[PDB]
Coordinates of C-alpha atoms and ligand atoms in Angstrom, one line a residue:
Chain A
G1 CA -26.7 18.3 -23.9
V2 CA -29.5 15.8 -24.0
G3 CA -31.1 17.4 -27.0
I4 CA -28.3 17.5 -29.6
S5 CA -26.3 14.9 -31.9
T6 CA -22.5 14.6 -31.4
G7 CA -21.7 12.9 -34.6
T8 CA -22.2 11.7 -38.2
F9 CA -22.8 8.3 -39.5
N10 CA -20.2 7.6 -42.2
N11 CA -19.6 4.2 -44.1
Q12 CA -18.0 5.4 -47.5
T13 CA -14.8 3.9 -48.7
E14 CA -12.7 6.5 -50.5
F15 CA -10.0 5.8 -53.0
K16 CA -7.6 8.8 -53.5
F17 CA -5.2 8.1 -56.7
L18 CA -1.9 10.0 -56.1
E19 CA 1.1 10.3 -58.6
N20 CA 3.1 7.3 -59.5
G21 CA 0.5 4.7 -59.2
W22 CA -0.1 5.0 -55.5
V23 CA -3.6 4.8 -54.1
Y24 CA -4.5 6.3 -50.6
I25 CA -7.7 4.0 -49.4
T26 CA -9.8 5.5 -46.5
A27 CA -12.2 3.0 -45.2
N28 CA -15.1 4.6 -43.2
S29 CA -17.1 2.3 -41.2
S30 CA -19.7 3.1 -38.4
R31 CA -22.4 1.0 -36.4
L32 CA -25.1 1.2 -33.9
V33 CA -24.0 -1.0 -31.0
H34 CA -26.4 -2.2 -28.3
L35 CA -25.3 -3.1 -24.7
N36 CA -26.8 -4.8 -21.6
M37 CA -25.8 -4.5 -18.0
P38 CA -23.3 -7.1 -16.7
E39 CA -24.9 -10.2 -15.2
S40 CA -22.7 -9.7 -12.1
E41 CA -20.5 -6.7 -11.0
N42 CA -17.6 -9.0 -9.9
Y43 CA -14.7 -10.5 -11.3
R44 CA -14.9 -14.4 -11.6
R45 CA -12.1 -16.9 -11.6
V46 CA -13.7 -19.9 -13.4
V47 CA -12.4 -23.5 -14.4
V48 CA -13.8 -25.5 -17.3
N49 CA -13.3 -29.4 -17.0
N50 CA -14.9 -31.6 -19.7
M51 CA -13.2 -34.7 -18.4
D52 CA -16.5 -36.5 -19.4
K53 CA -15.2 -36.4 -23.1
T54 CA -11.5 -37.0 -22.7
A55 CA -12.3 -39.9 -20.1
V56 CA -13.1 -41.9 -23.4
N57 CA -9.7 -43.2 -24.8
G58 CA -8.7 -42.1 -28.0
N59 CA -10.6 -38.4 -27.5
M60 CA -7.4 -36.4 -26.5
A61 CA -7.9 -33.9 -29.2
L62 CA -11.5 -32.9 -27.7
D63 CA -9.7 -31.3 -24.6
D64 CA -11.5 -28.1 -23.5
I65 CA -10.1 -27.5 -20.0
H66 CA -8.7 -24.2 -19.0
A67 CA -9.1 -21.4 -16.5
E68 CA -10.3 -18.0 -17.2
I69 CA -11.2 -14.8 -15.5
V70 CA -14.7 -13.5 -16.2
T71 CA -14.8 -9.7 -16.2
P72 CA -17.9 -7.5 -16.0
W73 CA -16.6 -5.5 -19.2
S74 CA -17.3 -5.7 -22.9
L75 CA -14.9 -5.8 -25.7
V76 CA -15.6 -3.6 -28.9
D77 CA -13.6 -5.1 -31.5
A78 CA -13.5 -4.3 -35.2
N79 CA -10.6 -6.4 -36.4
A80 CA -11.8 -8.2 -39.3
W81 CA -12.1 -7.3 -43.2
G82 CA -15.7 -7.5 -43.4
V83 CA -16.1 -4.6 -41.0
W84 CA -14.7 -2.4 -43.5
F85 CA -15.1 -3.5 -47.0
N86 CA -18.0 -4.9 -49.1
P87 CA -17.7 -7.2 -52.0
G88 CA -17.6 -4.4 -54.4
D89 CA -14.5 -2.8 -52.6
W90 CA -12.7 -6.0 -52.5
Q91 CA -13.1 -6.7 -56.2
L92 CA -11.3 -3.4 -56.9
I93 CA -8.5 -3.8 -54.6
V94 CA -7.8 -7.7 -55.5
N95 CA -8.0 -7.1 -59.1
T96 CA -6.1 -3.8 -59.4
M97 CA -3.5 -3.4 -56.6
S98 CA -0.3 -5.1 -56.2
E99 CA 0.4 -4.7 -52.6
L100 CA -1.4 -3.3 -49.4
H101 CA 0.1 -1.2 -46.5
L102 CA -1.7 -0.6 -43.3
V103 CA -1.3 3.0 -42.2
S104 CA -3.7 4.5 -39.5
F105 CA -6.7 3.7 -37.3
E106 CA -9.1 5.4 -35.0
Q107 CA -12.5 5.1 -33.3
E108 CA -15.3 7.3 -31.8
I109 CA -18.4 6.9 -29.8
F110 CA -21.2 9.3 -29.9
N111 CA -24.9 9.8 -29.6
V112 CA -24.9 7.6 -26.4
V113 CA -28.4 6.6 -24.9
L114 CA -29.3 4.8 -21.8
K115 CA -32.7 3.7 -21.2
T116 CA -34.3 2.0 -18.2
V117 CA -36.7 -0.9 -18.3
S118 CA -40.0 -0.6 -16.4
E119 CA -41.8 -3.7 -15.7
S120 CA -45.6 -2.9 -16.1
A121 CA -46.3 -6.3 -14.4
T122 CA -50.1 -6.4 -15.1
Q123 CA -52.6 -7.6 -17.6
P124 CA -50.1 -9.0 -20.2
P125 CA -47.9 -7.7 -18.3
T126 CA -46.3 -4.8 -20.0
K127 CA -42.9 -3.2 -20.3
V128 CA -41.7 0.4 -20.4
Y129 CA -38.6 1.9 -21.6
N130 CA -37.7 5.3 -20.3
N131 CA -34.6 7.4 -20.9
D132 CA -32.4 7.8 -17.8
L133 CA -30.7 11.2 -18.7
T134 CA -28.4 10.9 -15.7
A135 CA -27.1 7.2 -16.3
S136 CA -23.6 6.8 -17.4
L137 CA -21.8 4.5 -20.0
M138 CA -18.3 3.7 -18.9
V139 CA -15.4 3.8 -21.5
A140 CA -11.7 2.4 -21.0
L141 CA -9.2 2.5 -23.6
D142 CA -6.0 0.3 -22.8
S143 CA -3.6 2.4 -24.6
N144 CA -0.4 1.0 -23.0
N145 CA -1.7 -2.4 -23.5
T146 CA -1.5 -3.7 -19.8
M147 CA -4.3 -6.1 -20.6
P148 CA -3.8 -9.5 -22.4
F149 CA -4.6 -9.5 -26.1
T150 CA -8.0 -11.0 -27.1
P151 CA -8.8 -10.6 -30.7
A152 CA -12.4 -11.5 -31.2
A153 CA -12.0 -12.5 -34.7
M154 CA -10.5 -15.7 -33.2
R155 CA -14.1 -17.0 -32.2
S156 CA -16.0 -14.9 -34.5
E157 CA -17.3 -12.5 -31.9
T158 CA -16.2 -9.3 -34.0
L159 CA -18.7 -6.4 -35.0
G160 CA -21.2 -7.2 -37.4
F161 CA -20.6 -6.7 -41.3
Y162 CA -23.7 -4.6 -42.4
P163 CA -23.8 -0.8 -42.1
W164 CA -27.7 -1.1 -41.8
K165 CA -28.0 -3.8 -39.1
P166 CA -27.3 -3.1 -35.4
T167 CA -24.6 -4.8 -33.6
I168 CA -23.3 -5.8 -30.3
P169 CA -19.7 -6.2 -28.5
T170 CA -18.6 -9.3 -26.6
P171 CA -18.0 -10.0 -23.0
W172 CA -14.6 -9.4 -22.0
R173 CA -12.6 -12.4 -20.4
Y174 CA -9.0 -13.5 -20.4
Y175 CA -6.9 -16.7 -19.5
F176 CA -5.6 -17.6 -16.1
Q177 CA -2.8 -20.0 -15.4
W178 CA -3.3 -23.7 -14.6
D179 CA -1.5 -26.9 -14.6
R180 CA -3.1 -29.9 -16.7
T181 CA -1.9 -33.3 -17.5
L182 CA -3.2 -35.7 -20.1
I183 CA -1.7 -39.0 -21.4
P184 CA -2.7 -39.9 -25.0
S185 CA -4.4 -43.3 -25.7
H186 CA -6.5 -45.0 -28.3
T187 CA -9.6 -47.2 -28.5
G188 CA -7.8 -50.5 -27.8
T189 CA -5.8 -48.9 -24.8
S190 CA -6.6 -50.7 -21.6
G191 CA -7.3 -48.9 -18.2
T192 CA -7.4 -45.3 -17.6
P193 CA -4.4 -43.2 -19.1
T194 CA -3.9 -40.1 -16.6
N195 CA -6.2 -37.1 -16.9
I196 CA -5.3 -34.6 -14.2
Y197 CA -5.9 -31.0 -13.5
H198 CA -3.0 -30.0 -11.0
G199 CA -4.1 -26.4 -10.5
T200 CA -2.4 -23.0 -10.3
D201 CA 1.3 -22.3 -10.0
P202 CA 1.8 -19.3 -7.8
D203 CA 4.6 -17.9 -10.0
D204 CA 2.4 -17.5 -13.1
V205 CA -0.7 -15.9 -11.4
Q206 CA -1.7 -12.5 -12.9
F207 CA -5.0 -11.2 -11.8
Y208 CA -5.8 -7.9 -13.9
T209 CA -8.4 -5.3 -13.3
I210 CA -9.5 -2.6 -15.6
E211 CA -10.4 -0.2 -12.7
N212 CA -6.9 -0.7 -11.3
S213 CA -5.0 -0.1 -14.5
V214 CA -6.9 2.1 -17.1
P215 CA -8.6 5.5 -16.6
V216 CA -12.3 5.1 -16.8
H217 CA -14.7 7.7 -18.6
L218 CA -18.2 8.3 -17.7
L219 CA -20.3 9.4 -20.7
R220 CA -24.0 10.6 -20.4
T221 CA -26.1 11.4 -23.4
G222 CA -24.6 14.6 -24.2
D223 CA -21.1 13.0 -24.1
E224 CA -18.8 11.7 -26.7
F225 CA -15.5 9.9 -26.7
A226 CA -12.7 10.0 -29.5
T227 CA -9.5 8.3 -29.9
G228 CA -6.5 10.1 -31.3
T229 CA -5.1 8.7 -34.8
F230 CA -2.9 5.4 -34.4
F231 CA -0.3 4.9 -36.9
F232 CA 0.7 1.2 -37.8
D233 CA 4.3 -0.1 -38.2
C234 CA 4.1 -3.3 -40.4
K235 CA 5.6 -4.8 -43.5
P236 CA 3.6 -4.6 -46.7
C237 CA 1.3 -7.3 -47.8
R238 CA 1.5 -8.5 -51.5
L239 CA -1.8 -9.2 -53.4
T240 CA 0.0 -11.4 -55.9
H241 CA 0.9 -15.1 -56.0
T242 CA 3.9 -17.0 -56.7
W243 CA 3.5 -20.4 -58.6
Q244 CA 7.0 -21.9 -59.2
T245 CA 8.0 -24.6 -57.2
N246 CA 11.7 -26.1 -57.0
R247 CA 10.9 -27.8 -60.3
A248 CA 10.4 -24.5 -62.2
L249 CA 13.6 -22.6 -61.3
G250 CA 16.3 -21.6 -63.6
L251 CA 17.3 -22.8 -67.2
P252 CA 15.1 -25.6 -68.4
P253 CA 17.0 -28.5 -70.4
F254 CA 17.8 -27.5 -74.2
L255 CA 15.5 -29.7 -76.4
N256 CA 17.3 -31.1 -79.2
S257 CA 14.1 -32.4 -80.7
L258 CA 11.1 -30.4 -81.3
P259 CA 7.4 -31.3 -82.1
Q260 CA 6.4 -31.2 -85.9
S261 CA 2.6 -31.4 -85.3
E262 CA 0.4 -29.3 -83.3
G263 CA -1.3 -31.0 -80.2
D264 CA -0.1 -31.0 -76.7
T265 CA 0.2 -34.8 -77.2
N266 CA 3.1 -34.2 -79.5
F267 CA 6.2 -33.8 -77.0
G268 CA 9.6 -32.2 -77.6
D269 CA 12.7 -34.4 -76.3
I270 CA 15.7 -33.2 -74.7
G271 CA 17.8 -35.9 -76.6
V272 CA 20.7 -36.6 -74.3
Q273 CA 21.1 -39.7 -72.2
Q274 CA 20.5 -38.8 -68.7
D275 CA 23.9 -40.1 -67.6
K276 CA 25.6 -38.2 -70.4
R277 CA 24.2 -34.7 -69.6
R278 CA 26.1 -31.7 -68.3
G279 CA 25.1 -29.5 -65.6
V280 CA 25.3 -29.2 -61.8
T281 CA 23.8 -32.0 -59.2
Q282 CA 24.2 -32.3 -55.3
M283 CA 24.5 -36.4 -55.7
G284 CA 28.2 -36.7 -55.6
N285 CA 27.9 -40.6 -56.4
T286 CA 25.9 -40.6 -59.8
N287 CA 26.0 -39.3 -63.2
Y288 CA 22.2 -38.8 -63.5
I289 CA 21.1 -35.2 -64.4
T290 CA 17.3 -35.3 -64.0
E291 CA 14.9 -32.8 -63.5
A292 CA 14.3 -34.0 -60.1
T293 CA 18.1 -34.2 -59.6
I294 CA 19.6 -31.2 -61.1
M295 CA 20.6 -28.5 -58.4
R296 CA 18.3 -25.7 -57.6
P297 CA 19.5 -22.3 -55.6
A298 CA 17.6 -23.2 -52.4
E299 CA 14.1 -24.6 -51.3
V300 CA 10.6 -23.2 -51.7
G301 CA 8.4 -24.3 -48.9
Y302 CA 8.9 -27.0 -46.3
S303 CA 7.5 -30.3 -44.8
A304 CA 6.2 -30.3 -41.2
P305 CA 4.7 -33.0 -39.3
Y306 CA 0.8 -33.2 -39.7
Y307 CA -2.0 -33.9 -37.1
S308 CA 0.8 -33.4 -34.6
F309 CA -0.4 -32.6 -31.0
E310 CA 2.6 -31.2 -28.6
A311 CA 2.2 -30.9 -25.0
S312 CA 3.3 -28.5 -22.3
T313 CA 2.3 -27.2 -18.8
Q314 CA -1.4 -26.8 -19.9
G315 CA -2.3 -29.5 -22.1
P316 CA -2.1 -30.6 -25.7
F317 CA -2.2 -28.4 -28.8
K318 CA -2.0 -28.7 -32.6
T319 CA 1.3 -28.0 -34.4
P320 CA 0.8 -24.9 -36.6
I321 CA 1.7 -25.0 -40.6
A322 CA 2.6 -22.1 -42.6
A323 CA 2.0 -23.3 -46.2
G324 CA 0.8 -22.4 -49.6
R325 CA -1.1 -25.1 -51.7
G326 CA 1.5 -27.3 -53.5
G327 CA -0.8 -29.9 -55.3
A328 CA -3.4 -29.8 -57.9
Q329 CA -6.5 -28.8 -56.4
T330 CA -8.7 -31.9 -56.6
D331 CA -5.7 -33.5 -54.7
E332 CA -4.1 -31.6 -52.2
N333 CA -4.0 -32.9 -48.5
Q334 CA -5.3 -29.9 -46.5
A335 CA -3.9 -31.1 -43.3
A336 CA -0.3 -31.2 -44.8
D337 CA -0.8 -27.6 -45.8
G338 CA -2.9 -26.4 -42.9
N339 CA -5.6 -24.7 -44.8
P340 CA -7.6 -22.7 -42.1
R341 CA -11.3 -23.3 -41.7
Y342 CA -13.8 -20.7 -40.8
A343 CA -17.1 -21.1 -38.9
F344 CA -19.2 -18.3 -38.3
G345 CA -22.9 -17.0 -38.5
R346 CA -25.9 -14.5 -39.3
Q347 CA -23.9 -11.6 -38.3
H348 CA -20.6 -12.3 -40.2
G349 CA -21.7 -13.8 -43.6
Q350 CA -24.0 -16.8 -43.1
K351 CA -27.4 -16.2 -44.7
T352 CA -29.2 -13.7 -42.8
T353 CA -32.4 -15.4 -43.0
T354 CA -31.2 -18.7 -41.7
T355 CA -32.6 -20.4 -38.6
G356 CA -30.9 -22.6 -36.1
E357 CA -27.4 -22.6 -34.2
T358 CA -25.4 -24.6 -37.0
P359 CA -22.9 -22.1 -38.2
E360 CA -21.6 -21.6 -41.8
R361 CA -18.0 -22.5 -42.9
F362 CA -15.4 -22.8 -45.4
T363 CA -11.9 -23.9 -45.8
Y364 CA -9.7 -21.3 -47.6
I365 CA -7.4 -22.7 -50.1
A366 CA -4.6 -20.2 -51.1
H367 CA -3.5 -19.6 -54.8
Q368 CA 0.2 -19.6 -53.9
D369 CA 2.1 -22.8 -54.5
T370 CA 4.1 -23.4 -51.4
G371 CA 2.7 -26.5 -50.1
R372 CA 3.4 -30.2 -50.4
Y373 CA 1.8 -33.4 -51.6
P374 CA 3.1 -35.9 -49.2
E375 CA 1.7 -39.0 -51.3
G376 CA 4.6 -37.8 -53.6
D377 CA 7.5 -37.9 -51.3
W378 CA 9.9 -41.0 -50.9
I379 CA 13.4 -41.5 -49.2
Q380 CA 16.1 -43.7 -50.6
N381 CA 19.4 -45.3 -49.8
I382 CA 22.6 -43.3 -50.8
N383 CA 23.9 -46.2 -53.1
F384 CA 21.1 -45.0 -55.4
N385 CA 21.2 -47.8 -57.9
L386 CA 17.7 -47.7 -59.9
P387 CA 15.2 -49.2 -60.0
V388 CA 15.3 -48.9 -56.4
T389 CA 14.8 -52.2 -54.4
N390 CA 12.0 -52.2 -51.6
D391 CA 14.7 -52.4 -49.0
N392 CA 16.3 -49.1 -49.9
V393 CA 13.2 -47.0 -50.1
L394 CA 10.9 -45.7 -47.3
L395 CA 7.6 -44.8 -49.1
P396 CA 4.7 -42.6 -47.5
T397 CA 3.1 -46.1 -47.8
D398 CA 5.4 -48.1 -45.5
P399 CA 4.1 -48.2 -41.8
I400 CA 6.0 -46.4 -38.9
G401 CA 6.0 -47.8 -35.3
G402 CA 4.1 -50.9 -36.5
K403 CA 1.1 -48.6 -37.1
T404 CA -0.8 -49.1 -40.3
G405 CA -2.0 -45.5 -40.7
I406 CA 1.3 -43.6 -39.7
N407 CA 3.8 -42.4 -42.3
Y408 CA 7.4 -41.0 -42.1
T409 CA 5.8 -37.9 -43.9
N410 CA 3.7 -37.6 -40.8
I411 CA 6.5 -36.7 -38.6
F412 CA 8.7 -35.4 -41.3
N413 CA 10.3 -31.8 -41.3
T414 CA 12.4 -30.3 -43.9
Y415 CA 12.8 -26.6 -42.6
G416 CA 16.3 -25.6 -42.8
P417 CA 18.7 -22.6 -43.8
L418 CA 17.5 -23.0 -47.4
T419 CA 14.0 -22.4 -46.7
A420 CA 11.9 -19.8 -48.5
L421 CA 8.2 -19.1 -47.9
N422 CA 5.7 -16.4 -48.2
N423 CA 3.4 -14.7 -45.5
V424 CA -0.3 -15.5 -45.2
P425 CA -2.8 -14.0 -47.5
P426 CA -5.8 -11.9 -46.5
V427 CA -9.0 -13.7 -46.0
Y428 CA -12.2 -11.8 -46.9
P429 CA -14.5 -11.1 -45.2
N430 CA -13.8 -13.3 -41.9
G431 CA -10.2 -12.8 -41.6
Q432 CA -8.4 -10.7 -38.8
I433 CA -6.4 -7.7 -40.3
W434 CA -3.5 -6.9 -37.8
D435 CA -2.0 -8.9 -34.7
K436 CA 0.2 -8.0 -31.7
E437 CA 3.6 -9.7 -31.7
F438 CA 4.7 -12.3 -29.1
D439 CA 6.8 -10.8 -26.4
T440 CA 9.4 -13.3 -26.4
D441 CA 13.2 -12.8 -27.0
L442 CA 13.0 -14.4 -30.5
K443 CA 10.1 -13.8 -32.5
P444 CA 8.2 -16.0 -35.0
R445 CA 8.8 -15.1 -38.8
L446 CA 5.1 -14.8 -39.3
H447 CA 1.7 -15.4 -37.7
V448 CA -0.9 -17.6 -39.4
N449 CA -3.9 -15.6 -38.2
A450 CA -3.2 -12.2 -39.7
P451 CA -1.1 -10.6 -42.5
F452 CA -0.2 -7.4 -40.4
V453 CA 1.9 -7.7 -37.2
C454 CA 2.6 -4.7 -35.4
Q455 CA 6.3 -4.5 -35.0
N456 CA 6.0 -1.6 -32.2
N457 CA 2.9 -1.6 -30.2
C458 CA -0.7 -2.4 -31.6
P459 CA -3.6 -0.4 -30.8
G460 CA -4.8 -0.8 -27.5
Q461 CA -8.1 -2.5 -26.7
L462 CA -11.5 -0.5 -25.9
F463 CA -13.7 -1.9 -23.2
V464 CA -17.2 -0.4 -22.5
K465 CA -19.7 -0.9 -19.7
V466 CA -23.0 0.3 -18.3
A467 CA -22.3 1.9 -15.0
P468 CA -24.2 0.5 -11.9
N469 CA -27.6 2.1 -11.4
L470 CA -28.9 1.6 -7.8
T471 CA -32.2 1.7 -6.1
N472 CA -33.0 3.1 -2.8
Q473 CA -31.9 0.2 -1.0
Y474 CA -28.4 -0.9 -1.2
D475 CA -26.4 -2.4 1.6
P476 CA -22.4 -3.0 1.1
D477 CA -22.5 -5.7 3.6
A478 CA -24.4 -8.2 1.7
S479 CA -23.2 -11.6 0.6
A480 CA -26.3 -12.0 -1.7
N481 CA -25.7 -9.8 -4.9
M482 CA -27.3 -6.6 -4.5
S483 CA -30.1 -4.9 -6.6
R484 CA -29.8 -2.5 -9.6
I485 CA -32.3 -1.0 -12.0
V486 CA -32.4 -2.7 -15.2
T487 CA -30.6 -0.4 -17.5
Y488 CA -29.3 -0.6 -21.0
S489 CA -27.3 1.4 -23.5
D490 CA -27.2 2.2 -27.3
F491 CA -24.8 4.1 -28.8
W492 CA -23.0 4.8 -32.4
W493 CA -19.4 3.8 -33.2
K494 CA -17.5 5.1 -35.8
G495 CA -14.0 4.1 -37.2
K496 CA -11.5 4.9 -40.0
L497 CA -9.0 2.7 -41.2
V498 CA -6.4 3.8 -43.9
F499 CA -4.3 1.7 -46.2
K500 CA -2.1 2.6 -49.0
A501 CA -1.8 0.6 -52.2
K502 CA 0.2 0.5 -55.4
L503 CA -1.6 0.0 -58.9
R504 CA -0.5 -2.8 -61.1
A505 CA 0.5 -2.9 -64.8
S506 CA 0.3 -5.5 -67.5
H507 CA 3.6 -7.5 -68.1
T508 CA 2.6 -10.5 -70.0
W509 CA 1.1 -11.1 -73.4
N510 CA -1.7 -13.1 -71.6
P511 CA -4.7 -11.9 -69.6
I512 CA -4.4 -12.4 -65.9
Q513 CA -7.3 -13.9 -63.5
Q514 CA -9.6 -11.3 -62.2
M515 CA -12.6 -11.5 -59.7
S516 CA -16.0 -11.3 -61.8
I517 CA -19.8 -11.4 -61.2
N518 CA -21.4 -14.1 -63.4
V519 CA -25.0 -16.1 -63.8
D520 CA -23.8 -18.4 -61.1
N521 CA -22.6 -16.2 -58.4
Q522 CA -24.9 -13.3 -59.3
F523 CA -27.3 -13.6 -56.3
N524 CA -24.7 -13.8 -53.6
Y525 CA -24.3 -10.1 -54.0
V526 CA -27.7 -8.8 -53.6
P527 CA -30.8 -9.1 -51.1
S528 CA -33.8 -11.6 -51.2
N529 CA -37.3 -10.7 -51.6
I530 CA -37.4 -11.1 -47.9
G531 CA -34.4 -9.0 -47.4
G532 CA -31.9 -11.6 -46.4
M533 CA -28.1 -11.2 -47.0
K534 CA -25.2 -13.1 -46.9
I535 CA -21.4 -12.2 -47.5
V536 CA -19.6 -15.0 -49.3
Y537 CA -15.7 -15.3 -49.1
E538 CA -13.3 -14.5 -51.8
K539 CA -9.6 -14.9 -52.5
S540 CA -7.1 -12.1 -52.5
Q541 CA -3.9 -13.0 -54.4
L542 CA -5.3 -13.7 -58.0
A543 CA -2.4 -12.5 -60.2
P544 CA 1.0 -14.4 -60.6
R545 CA 4.4 -12.9 -60.0
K546 CA 8.1 -14.5 -60.8
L547 CA 9.7 -16.2 -57.8
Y548 CA 13.2 -16.2 -59.4
Chain B
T1 CA 52.4 -18.9 -29.0
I2 CA 51.7 -15.8 -26.7
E3 CA 55.4 -14.7 -27.3
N4 CA 54.9 -14.3 -31.0
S5 CA 51.6 -12.6 -31.0
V6 CA 51.0 -10.4 -27.9
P7 CA 53.4 -8.0 -26.2
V8 CA 54.5 -9.2 -22.8
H9 CA 54.8 -6.9 -19.8
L10 CA 57.5 -7.5 -17.2
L11 CA 56.3 -6.5 -13.6
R12 CA 58.6 -6.1 -10.7
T13 CA 57.2 -5.3 -7.2
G14 CA 57.0 -1.5 -7.7
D15 CA 55.2 -2.3 -11.1
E16 CA 51.3 -2.2 -11.7
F17 CA 49.4 -3.1 -14.7
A18 CA 46.0 -1.6 -15.7
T19 CA 43.5 -2.3 -18.5
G20 CA 41.4 0.4 -20.3
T21 CA 37.8 0.4 -19.9
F22 CA 36.0 -2.1 -22.4
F23 CA 32.3 -1.4 -23.5
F24 CA 30.2 -4.3 -24.3
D25 CA 27.6 -4.3 -27.4
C26 CA 25.0 -6.9 -26.1
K27 CA 21.3 -7.2 -26.2
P28 CA 19.3 -6.5 -22.8
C29 CA 18.7 -9.5 -20.5
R30 CA 15.3 -9.8 -19.0
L31 CA 14.5 -10.4 -15.5
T32 CA 11.0 -11.7 -16.1
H33 CA 9.3 -15.0 -17.3
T34 CA 6.6 -15.7 -19.5
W35 CA 4.1 -18.4 -18.5
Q36 CA 1.8 -19.0 -21.5
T37 CA 1.8 -21.8 -23.6
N38 CA 0.0 -22.1 -27.0
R39 CA -2.9 -23.1 -24.8
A40 CA -3.3 -19.7 -23.1
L41 CA -3.0 -17.3 -26.2
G42 CA -6.0 -15.2 -27.1
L43 CA -9.8 -14.9 -26.4
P44 CA -11.0 -18.0 -24.2
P45 CA -14.4 -19.5 -25.2
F46 CA -17.4 -17.6 -23.8
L47 CA -19.1 -19.7 -21.0
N48 CA -22.7 -19.9 -21.4
Ligands
LIG1 CA1 -1.4 -22.0 -58.4

């Protein structure tokens, strides 16, 4: 079987329009993957300890210590938008559809190849690559999800984003329990705080091996591996955004006085004393019915502490925020809303002809207004009594704990039974698509890394590796790691991701926002005279929708 | 008052009281523990 192909390369995106404005979107993607043999054939238990950085008072946030198990296997991950759609497809989806559903997924490996490097050490010296028609590529598909879930998108180590550029997988490794203590401090702080790595707790040790828990497949050149189809069980994702905040819900006040001259500087007027109006309020001790005072059904969005690090058994970590963008973009407070920032390079969006190790990056700012503008907040004594007196107001300007740079908004939290929020929006092309759910008794209401969370089981991970190619002399009783013939593999990967979407219709007299090419961005969607490419990020929920 | 809201049974030496069977409707309880904190979720950083 050494002389014939076992597959077809396919990277077409098909749109199947069904009855009732429902679209069937089939995303074919295939790639050439290159794989080298492991540096070592054993599992290593390694600890990282950058105490040199955190030993400097006021550097707590740069903590990198952890323990991980380094495995001799590689992970083939394709969970990122860029792997399946090009800017052309994204425009069609984002401008036309109103919601997206994740249906099924499947992959395949074919046309496997294993070559061997012959070191013609002489003259230059030279190298020679020869096919080893009996060598084997090892393939393991963790279908029961025994292994820990490690989504490569998190560290931008997913499959490349160009159908015509070869790619590679990432070495697989997972976390291993450890106990760590780090006490906070600042520049002034005297002495040394407490920076200790206690070790490992016995009741939390879990050493996993692929050999012991998954059936391994041996593929030779004439072999091919296919996965069945997997059907997702997730909630639909909306491609629309809400714009109403608590201030724009319900019946506005009737204006007894209207403008008589064109110009947005000629205002209308309610025309009724603020303390003589009618309506409902949740302030029992006053008669002022203001647009900031009148009652609204519940609350859109919430306030959370910002640049807050909490600590537990293995060190400090940032407190996540699930928020939109409340606040005119020019003003914002991306910390308060927790906008994500993405760093990546060459293989996932950064200009292909660039040089150097500095990544490319961007901070995604959503369209939905479910965020907060802290500087606008304030708290006041119940006696009310305006104008409020300095002693009856806490401003995002008054210091807390004596600190001049810390607010109350800084540790404030207004999440409660009246809180309404929206899920996270897709992020093309660097975003992760789906995510496994936490196996805790009570689950989160959403995840901040991906729009689709598998309610049942997610698709298990696919691990690949080059089987050992031994020489004439091998001795099992040898501390010093043995010898293998330098071997590497090249194989084609192919996958299919099917979504189901719904076409939108016009409902307002005015046009809506739409993605479009133009004089300015034009050259971000075409190659350079040298063949340099790049994939600029786009936004997914242009197009408003009512909230209430 | 128990007298006003429940039927009272009088048992003498030769008497006996039995309850029927009652079937609970609760979520299962796990006899396992999790050890991962926010710091041990996902793909660790590749060590060069
Ligand atoms: Ca907006």
